[PDB]
Design a protein around this nucleic acid. Structure first.
Ligand SMILES: [Zn+2]
Ligand SMILES: [Zn+2]
Lengths: 197, 197
DNA sequence: CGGGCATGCCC
DNA sequence: CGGGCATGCCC
């Protein structure tokens, strides 16, 4: 019984995929996504819109869960949590949770009783009409560099689509780097990929 | 009734002054003192020997107190304390105290009931015989850069010599920078002083 | 807003 | 051990 959740992409029978908005070119843009690295660069405590795309409409009662895990093998089995500084100076969200959802009246924050991992869950809502996706506003409450938290360790966010019975319907993931200057750090990484990847 | 303790040098009638040991040239020497800047550069949680020199022998019951205060006017009135990370992962010393004394069976840690400032106190002991000074081993439990603690703000350590009745007998102070590479940072600062001081 | 320095750590 | 990069922030 592993305590490390799968990160394997599983688009499933509903054709579940993630979308991200294009952003500005600014050195310190608040949120920016790199398709080449499948990686979000964003600033702490600010909005990161993630779009949910499906080919088929999930059944009523379907839920959307987000959870962070460390990306490197050496840190994979350690629970991702808020650093003690940002925990201390911290409504519904427990202070130890890294990932929050804003703008949803039905958000649930879970602390797994066996694996101790944190996750945040909202109801899946189908797009309104004309629209092809549904947007969730996530918030990361620490910088990747936070001492006693992520401590410079890369993380993945895993988004899972789950029915009310608990069956996995779909899964996707993206890397996240919460940092002061997302535009600078995105360009630096893409350039490093080009020259020495 | 101010809550900012004096840092003014007061050598007093006993001729109280501080001494510091000369150290190596290494980039990451554990402790090194700059006479030009009256400034200690040291690594966290490691020994910083400070020598006490007097011209006249203090009376029995004399105490030696150390306390940190922020050096800049803008931060002067804020209590210097341990960051929440190093407080959490922390015998006699309360976890919130930045400055500890090692190797003394009579150490007292005080949290002032009116000003809320932290200090650590030991008995003054006169030099043994032949020696001209007495050494106290101090420990700083955070880096200057610790988020939620010093947060990159320069500090002074104020050493006061006090009689058992509480009269101030002498006072001296030095700046402290707790950092990963004290030798590098000392040379950088002395060079900056030379070129643009 | 982008340039550029200080500083912890690389693996 | 010293060189040198990443990254938060300068004031
Ligand atoms: Zn944090
Ligand atoms: Zn600290």
């Amino acid at each position: 019984s592993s305590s490390v959740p799968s990160q394997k992409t599983y688009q499933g029978s509903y054709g579940f995929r993630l979308g991200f908005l294009h952003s500005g070119t600014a050195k310190s843009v608040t949120c920016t996504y790199s398709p080449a690295l499948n990686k979000m660069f964003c600033q702490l405590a600010k909005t990161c819109p993630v779009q949910l795309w499906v080919d088929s409409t999930p059944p009523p009662g379907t839920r959307v869960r987000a959870m962070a895990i460390y990306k490197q093998s050496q840190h994979m089995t350690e629970v991702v949590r808020r650093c003690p500084h940002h925990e201390r100076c911290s409504g519904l969200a427990p202070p130890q949770h890294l990932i929050r959802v804003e703008g949803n009246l039905r958000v649930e924050y879970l602390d797994d009783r066996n694996t101790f991992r944190h996750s945040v869950v909202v109801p899946y809502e189908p797009p309104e009409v004309g629209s092809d996706c549904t947007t969730i506003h996530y918030n990361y409450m620490c910088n990747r560099s936070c001492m006693g938290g992520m401590n410079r360790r890369p993380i993945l966010t895993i988004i899972t689509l789950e029915d009310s019975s608990g069956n996995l319907l779909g899964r996707n993931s993206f890397e996240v780097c919460v940092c002061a200057c997302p535009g600078r750090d995105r360009r630096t990484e893409e350039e490093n990929l080009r020259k020495k990847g």
